[PDB]
């Protein structure tokens with residue numbers, strides 16, 4: 001079996017990583033939980049076993065076969081290269097390595113073949129990107145994709161445990177204490193790493209991550225760039241608006257595409273139904289469509305409201321929902337680890353291709 | 358001055374109609390409040406004076422100069438023709454008359470001229486449509502509009518007082534009692550008039566109004582049809598996805614357009630800033646963009662996140678926010694009534 005390390009085991013994603021590993025098909029001989037020095041020395045469960053949390057350091061990866069990183073880009077930048085140097089295969093949830101040409105950027109149902117060429121780090125795309133790729137790959141395969149316009153409705157758990165607690169606190173202040181939403185004090189959202197903070201309670205914040213120099217946010221540009229890499233087609237036009245809403249878990253997306261060939265609408269429904277990891281939930285006669293509150297806890301990605309554009313012959317609109325901590329993060333990463341195991345790719349890399357920081 | 362009747366004075370929109378009328382430049386000699394038989398006899402304020410709510414009937418409209426209807430399509434269908442007959446000018450908030458070719462469908466900043474052709478009824482458009490029209494008209498005027506694709510983030514007050522209360526109760530059950538959102542009982546949302554009801558707490562419901570035969574909802578199709586009528590151009594392609602989110606007041610919209618001519622972004626920003634009723638809030642270097650919580654209580658429509666599409670030469674994305682009970686409903690209606698007064702059309 002393997003020795004598996006979870007880096008960021010104490011976080012929002014980390015907690016789901018533990019659950020996904022407990023339920024995985026990976027043969028696990030030893031589990032290690034890694035976090036900051038603040039958590040090091042405390043205890044967390046794996047199934048019924050108590051596991052002592054360790055500090056993430058350049059030397060924490062000895063004997064580890066597979067490490068799953070969900071501790072923020074800076075932690076991955078700092079330590080993933082040392083893990084690779086120790087002989088580990090790293091599956092990284094963060095944005096840091098995603099656009100590195102030596103790093104496969106993988107959703108297993110879509111581009112598992114890219115795993116074959118790994119150099120010790122495999123990147124998991126952004127949560128919003130993953131669920132969109134699951135929904136759209138079955139369409140791309142049959143009718144092609146010319147462009148994508150997406151508007152997201154993103155849950156707060158993607159911003160971490162603190163963001164969840166801040167959201168809960170704000171909502172209670174309004175509903176229990178009678179605080180006006182515009183009077184709320186916020187410290188984290190929309191972005192922990194930005195200068196100003198705004199309430200999320202009863203609000204819709206059109207900022208996820210920080211702004212880039214083209215006036216799209218980093219989250220929007222992640223969707224654009226990761227789509228082109230995952231689908232291996234730079235010709236796919238992608239523009240996104242990423243909005244945080246008061247949901248704790250599960251992202252929703254209003255997705256518009258134009259295909260290359262006209263795609264019969266009922267066949268689009270059938271192709272999505274037929275695609276592993278995608279569930280067709282679409283019966284408007286009975287008000288059946290994907291809903292965030294129903295998707296929480298499931299590894300599947302749910303797709304409905306599928307319908308042609310009123311004017312563009314090749315245009316299609318749909319609604320895509322998935323649990324952002326599962327298929328959006330922890331489940332995609334554990335699925336990657338299972339795929340690596342199943343295809344004989346869990347082995348130390350020959351040459352180091354990543355800068356030590 | 359005028360005798361003004363508010364039909365549906367007791368509802369979410371009606372309460373704002375009262376507020377907007379109290380703050381209006383309309384000369385009001387007499388105010389009357391009308392609702393259903395079960396609200397009749399109760400009392401409600403207009404400024405400092407107590408007004409008795411009356412039951413809406415076929416003959417209740419005697420003496421009235423202006424009637425503002427915000428009591429749902431069925432009430433307007435039933436009673437508005439009788440008010441017109443009695444010589445009242447009706448301003449109707451509902452969907453019922455909006456696509457009647459003899460009824461002006463008006464956003465005063467955009468198509469006030471259409472009021473000149475009225476035959477006793479003027480329709481106020483759908484809330485989501487109104488704020489979109491305020492944002493996009495200044496662009497249409499200079500560079501044209503070829504198509505619109507919009508995804509909305511709609512507040513629950515658009516579904517009435519019941520929906521607001523249902524949303525608050527659901528959220529408290531989750532946060533205070535630890536009920537899972539998927540276990541909540543719901544009676545109103547997504548649509549009071551549809552068969553199945555779903556929780557809105559911690560959710561996003563991709564249904565507003567009921568479904569039509571082409572699998573878009575009536576809400577989505579209103580945005581399409583009302584846009585074409587208001588802008589008086591059937592060639593503007595419009596497709597919408599309308600979603601309810603856990604916000605009590607103020608709708609937000611992610612709006613994509615393609616213009617007919619390339620519209621430089623700084624000029625687009627300046628055209629929107631120049632347009633009455635639109636306020637530019639767009640300074641991403643200081644994280645300035647419209648937000649629902651800041652828009653509540655203002656009659657303005659706020660526009661930001663304005664940027665070029667990454668690929669389409671003529672494509673532009675933006676973010677549009679307005680209080681749905683104000684510019685989206687009660688303020689648009691009162692502004693129509695003021696415009697009627699100012700232009701001598703209260704006949």
Ligand SMILES: NC(=O)c1ccc[n+]([C@@H]2O[C@H](COP(=O)([O-])OP(=O)(O)OC[C@H]3O[C@@H](n4cnc5c(N)ncnc54)[C@H](OP(=O)(O)O)[C@@H]3O)[C@@H](O)[C@H]2O)c1
Pocket residue numbers: 007008009010011012013014034035036037038039040056070071072075159160161162163165
């Ligand atoms: N200060 C507050 O008011 C506040 C509010 C909410 C939660 N918290 C607690 O503080 C922790 C951080 O909150 P969060 O919202 O950032 O959690 P999170 O975003 O959901 O997860 C962050 C993960 O990254 C790990 N991490 C952070 N710095 C690291 C480093 N230098 N090396 C390796 N791993 C590192 C964290 O470990 P650590 O757990 O060791 O930091 C945690 O496992 C949480 O575990 C939570 O229990 C504090």
Ligand SMILES: NC(=O)c1ccc[n+]([C@@H]2O[C@H](COP(=O)([O-])OP(=O)(O)OC[C@H]3O[C@@H](n4cnc5c(N)ncnc54)[C@H](OP(=O)(O)O)[C@@H]3O)[C@@H](O)[C@H]2O)c1
Pocket residue numbers: 364365366367368369370371391392393394395396397399413427428429432516517518519520
């Ligand atoms: N006083 C009572 O004991 C009592 C009992 C039941 C309901 N209600 C009222 O019913 C409303 C139910 O909430 P909601 O979410 O449906 O409100 P809403 O959508 O926010 O507003 C609906 C408005 O339309 C009016 N209306 C409905 N049917 C009508 C008819 N046949 N003729 C004329 N006006 C009509 C309502 O008056 P009404 O207020 O008369 O419905 C109300 O003013 C509440 O606003 C409440 O005021 C009052």
Ligand SMILES: O=C(O)c1ccc([N+](=O)[O-])cc1P(=O)(O)O
Pocket residue numbers: 008013069070071072073074093094095096125126127329
């Ligand atoms: O931005 C992201 O996509 C992202 C997603 C997940 C995680 N994580 O630690 O699980 C971290 C990041 P980010 O690159 O740190 O912001």
Ligand SMILES: O=C(O)c1ccc([N+](=O)[O-])cc1P(=O)(O)O
Pocket residue numbers: 365370426427428429430431450451452453482483484566579686
């Ligand atoms: O659906 C609508 O557009 C709408 C909007 C406002 C009001 N109202 O009574 O203020 C009613 C309707 P609807 O046509 O009753 O559903």
Ligand code: NA
Pocket residue numbers: 272273274275276277278279280
């Ligand atoms: Na499937």
Ligand code: NA
Pocket residue numbers: 341342343344
């Ligand atoms: Na094998």
Ligand code: NA
Pocket residue numbers: 502503504592593594
């Ligand atoms: Na057109």
